[PDB]
Amino acid sequence: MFTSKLLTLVLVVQPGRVLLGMKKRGFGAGKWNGFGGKVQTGETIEQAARRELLEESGLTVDTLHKIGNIKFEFIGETELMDVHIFRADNYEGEPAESDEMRPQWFDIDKIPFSQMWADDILWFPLMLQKKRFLGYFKFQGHDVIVEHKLDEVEDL
Ligand SMILES: COc1nc(N)nc2c1ncn2[C@H]1C[C@H](O)[C@@H](COP(=O)(O)O)O1
Ligand SMILES: [Ca+2]
Ligand SMILES: [Ca+2]
Ligand SMILES: [Ca+2]
Ligand SMILES: [Cl-]
């Protein structure tokens, strides 16, 4: 890995359920996921996370918690993906479909992990316990994990 790209990911939760969206185009199309994107020059990471939540789901939030940082290395690439993960326990507005993503609430027992990125099932249990975490995954293509590190932490 020679260079890095910052990315964001936002999970909105309520008691017993999590808001995901079906990615309709682009990177990770066909997978359910949280909302997020890149960080423009002049934005903070949190500002960028809030922007993409609004553009993709129609929602805004007041309190937003930083919960995770996961680095992704894809075999054959020289750019690292540095993903900054946030949780909201409350929201403003009502979710609506965009050209990019279709939001849907899932009960905990219905989260569709076989139709999500392969990493998600491993850190979702930490997220649901209101924990913080650091990780690293090396992927061979989009659906095989070849190396994996993950740890609960106190601070990020
Ligand atoms: C590899 O494993 C991965 N696992 C998970 N859960 N999310 C991942 C991911 N790789 C990228 N992302 C997320 C970050 C962003 O929210 C969005 C891309 O930003 P846009 O292309 O929409 O601008 O996709
Ligand atoms: Ca996006
Ligand atoms: Ca976009
Ligand atoms: Ca956008
Ligand atoms: Cl696209």
Residue numbers in the entry: 1 to 156
Sentences from the paper on this structure:
MutT homologue 1 (MTH1) belongs to the NUDIX protein family and is known to be responsible for removal of oxidized purine nucleoside triphosphates from the nucleotide pool. We show that MutT homologue 1 (MTH1) efficiently catalyzes the hydrolysis of O6-methyl-dGTP with a catalytic efficiency similar to that for 8-oxo-dGTP. O6-methyl-dGTP activity is exclusive to MTH1 among human NUDIX proteins and conserved through evolution but not found in bacterial MutT. We present a high resolution crystal structure of human and zebrafish MTH1 in complex with O6-methyl-dGMP.
In order to study the binding mode of O6-methyl-dGTP and explain the high activity of MTH1 with O6-methyl-dGTP co-crystals of both human and zebrafish MTH1 with O6-methyl-dGTP were produced. The structure of human MTH1 with O6-methyl-dGMP, the hydrolysis product, was solved at a resolution of 1.80 Å, while the structure of zfMTH1 with O6-methyl-dGMP was solved at 0.99 Å resolution. Interestingly, when binding O6-methyl-dGMP Asp119 needs to be protonated but when binding 8-oxo-dGMP it seems as if either Asp119 or Asp120 could be protonated and in the MTH1 structure with 8-oxo-dGTP bound Asp119 is protonated. The few differences in the binding pocket, Y7L and P118A going from human to zebrafish, do not seem to influence the binding of O6-methyl-dGMP as shown in Supplementary Figure S4B. The crystallization condition for zfMTH1 included calcium ions and three calcium ions are found in the structure close to O6-methyl-dGMP and the NUDIX-box motif. The binding interface makes up a crystal contact, with D62 and D92 from a second monomer in the crystal interacting with the calcium ions. Since zfMTH1 was crystallized in presence of high concentrations of Ca2+ it is likely that the presence of Ca2+ instead of Mg2+ in the crystal structure is due to the used crystallization conditions. Another explanation for calcium ions being found in the zfMTH1 structure could be that zfMTH1 utilizes Ca2+ instead of Mg2+. However, when testing the activity of zfMTH1 upon replacing Mg2+ with Ca2+ no activity was observed disproving this theory. The zfMTH1 enzyme displays considerable activity with O6-methyl-dGTP with a clear preference over dGTP although the activity of zfMTH1 with O6-methyl-dGTP is not as high as for hMTH1.
